[PDB]
């Protein structure tokens, strides 16, 4: 009966879904699960190698998956322009729904993950006032999230009883061995390099990030949120924010990261805005030495140190969201973000990404 198709299983959320779904006490259980991704390689889950952006390969790989009941859409193309983000991401989404909906007679629910950029315009009101809420109108700017929702909504009409849910996290704290968008990983690699070079963990970000309130969204809680919507009647045909239930300051998270690598913590330096891309320019050889000296997973810096992403997060103000609707609709999940941050650092170490 309960059969998951995780679309993007090698990603950060894909991985959390991959670990949690098959567990004995998981709601909706016991689950059979398929994990789909572009890579070959690498256990209870039924792996399918598929390129979602190829109409033929999606037709070939997903049509035979006759028994799936719930799809979890957690993949995204990231392009140079937003217009391209729409062409690319729509094509992918359509390709999966066109391969699944016709061929799965027990399809109950598609769960779509987007993000907090639903609420955020380019710049450039027009804008929204935080904390962000779910059902206040869409901003007038182009946004591939909006396009994905409309596709989903349109495709839900072509089968009766088929439900949907949208999941909108903020900045994700998580892990996967292959992630190419890992904030926590990225900060671990920066910390590791500072330790190696005998340098202080200088703060690489703005003041609003250092001293303001921020939140974040745990990879495992986001997975639980997806699962909740799969099984809860009050979650059906609704969009929802997912964040941790608490608030933090980078001022304090920086010390925690410092402590986890035994490196001197830096403080907010007035008079700049300090970037990871700049500080880590030319560190490719230094990283290889760290990987060799310690018996690490053989990685290149560009695959584990995603600086532009970390800078985008640490160089801007964090606008908070609201968990009221999720709670009101019955999702009482939370995380203690400082503890979760330590936990995801530990996970980077356990997989020998970082020493
Ligand atoms: Na956690």
From Swiss-Prot:
- Provide the E.C. number(s) assigned to this enzyme: 1.3.1.3
Activity over temperature: Optimum temperature is 40 degrees Celsius.
Q: Which reaction does it catalyse?
A: 5beta-cholestan-3-one + NADP(+) = cholest-4-en-3-one + NADPH + H(+); 4,5beta-dihydrocortisone + NADP(+) = cortisone + NADPH + H(+)
Matching InterPro entries: NAD(P)-bd_dom_sf (IPR036291), PRISE-like_Rossmann-fold (IPR055222)
**Which Gene3D superfamilies does the UniProt entry name for this protein?**
NAD(P)-binding Rossmann-like Domain
What does the UniProt entry list as the effect of changing residue 145 to A/F? Complete loss of activity
Supply the Pfam families for this chain.
Answer: PRISE (PF22917)
Per the record, pH dependence is: Optimum pH is 7.8.
The protein's UniProt keywords, in alphabetical order, are:
NADP, Nucleotide-binding, Oxidoreductase
Asked if the Swiss-Prot or TrEMBL record annotates the protein with the keyword NADP, the reply is: yes
Q: Which residues form the active site?
A: 117, 145
UniProt binding sites for NADP(+): 10-12, 38-39, 51-52, 75, 113, 145, 172, 179-181
**Molecular function per GO:** Delta4-3-oxosteroid 5beta-reductase activity; nucleotide binding
Description of how the protein assembles with itself and partners = Homodimer.
Briefly state the protein's biological role.
Answer: Involved in cardenolide biosynthesis. Catalyzes the stereospecific conversion of progesterone to 5-beta-pregnane-3,20-dione. Can use progesterone, testosterone, 4-androstene-3,17-dione, cortisol and cortisone as substrates, but not pregnenolone, 21-OH-pregnenolone or isoprogesterone. NADPH could not be replaced by NADH.
Member of which family?
A: Belongs to the short-chain dehydrogenases/reductases (SDR) family. Highly divergent.
Q: What is this protein called?
A: 3-oxo-Delta(4,5)-steroid 5-beta-reductase
**Lineage of source species:** Eukaryota, Viridiplantae, Streptophyta, Embryophyta, Tracheophyta
